[PDB]
Amino acid sequence: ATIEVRNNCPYTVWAASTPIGGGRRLNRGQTWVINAPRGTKMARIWGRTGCNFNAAGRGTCQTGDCGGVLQCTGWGKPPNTLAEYALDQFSNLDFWDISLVDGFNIPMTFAPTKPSGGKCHAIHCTANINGECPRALKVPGGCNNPCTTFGGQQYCCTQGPCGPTELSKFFKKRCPDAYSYPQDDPTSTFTCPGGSTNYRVVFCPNG
Ligand SMILES: [Cl-]
């Protein structure tokens, strides 16, 4: 239920969190701890780079912008590396993952503060994705996922079952534990017994 967001990047990051949390400027080394009640589903945490806000919480960001506002209520504009989770009250299990479906912008580590074996352990995505990003998907500060750039069933899996693509394999290749495309569920979903642990999301785990 407790999620700790830590910015270990050498640059400032504007953490964002829905549906609870909002937004927060995080300078190098700063942490933000938010409480997520049991039953919180379809939640996500991400970081925003190159933002420019004025006293009122209005401005714009280079990546992951959520409507030109500091405290998000909606989703960020890709590309942005995602930390998704659902604290299910029915199975009493925590379902979480790192997703690249909406792109990549900042490397991160998603981990249980109390790993208990099985699929309940830290996962990472620290590859140099922005650096090796295919030219067709590359944007300032990030690397978009083929579904965002090209669209269509092939990449977005909007019409029905889909499979990996050469462009999706570019991400899975570099971050095996993360979602490379919409239906990359089997090797991208992790769980922990609900109530048995807390969570930590850190930007630039390798500094
Ligand atoms: Cl709670």
- Show the 3-state SS of 68-120: CECCCCCCCCCCCCEEEEEEECCCCEEEEEEECCCCECCCEEEEECCCCECCE
Hey, which residues does 3 pair with through a beta bridge? 34, 199
Output the CA 2–ligand 1 centroid distance in Å.
Answer: 8
Using the CB atoms, write b or e for 62-100: b if 16+ within 10 Å. Answer: bbbbbeebbebeebbbbbbbbbbbbbbeeeebbbbbbbb
- Secondary structure in 3-state letters for the chain: CEEEEEECCCCCEEEEEECCCEEEEECCCCEEEEECCCCCCCEEEEEEECCEEECCCEEECCECCCCCECCCCCCCCCCCCEEEEEEECCCCEEEEEEECCCCECCCEEEEECCCCECCECCEEECCCHHHHCCCCCEECCEECCHHHHCCCHHHHCCCCCCCCCCCHHHHHHHCCCCECCCCCCCCCCEEEECCCCCEEEEECCCC
How long a stretch of residues is the chain?
Answer: 207
Output the CA 1–ligand 1 centroid distance in Å.
Answer: 6
Amino acid at 8: N
Hey, which residues does 142 pair with through a beta bridge? 139
Q: Say how far apart CA 34 and CA 107 lie, in whole Å.
A: 21
Output the CA 14–ligand 1 centroid distance in Å.
Answer: 24
Residues 204 and 107 sit within 8 Å (Cβ to Cβ): yes
Output the CA 33–ligand 1 centroid distance in Å.
Answer: 13
Output the CA 94–ligand 1 centroid distance in Å.
Answer: 14
Domains of the chain (ranges plus CATH)?
1-207 (2.60.110.10)
Output the CA 38–ligand 1 centroid distance in Å.
Answer: 6
Resolution (A): 2.5
- For residue 9 the two structure tokens come to 């990047």
- For residue 66 the two structure tokens come to 């959520």
Hey, which residues does 79 pair with through a beta bridge? none
Q: Which residue has the tokens 């949390």?
A: 21
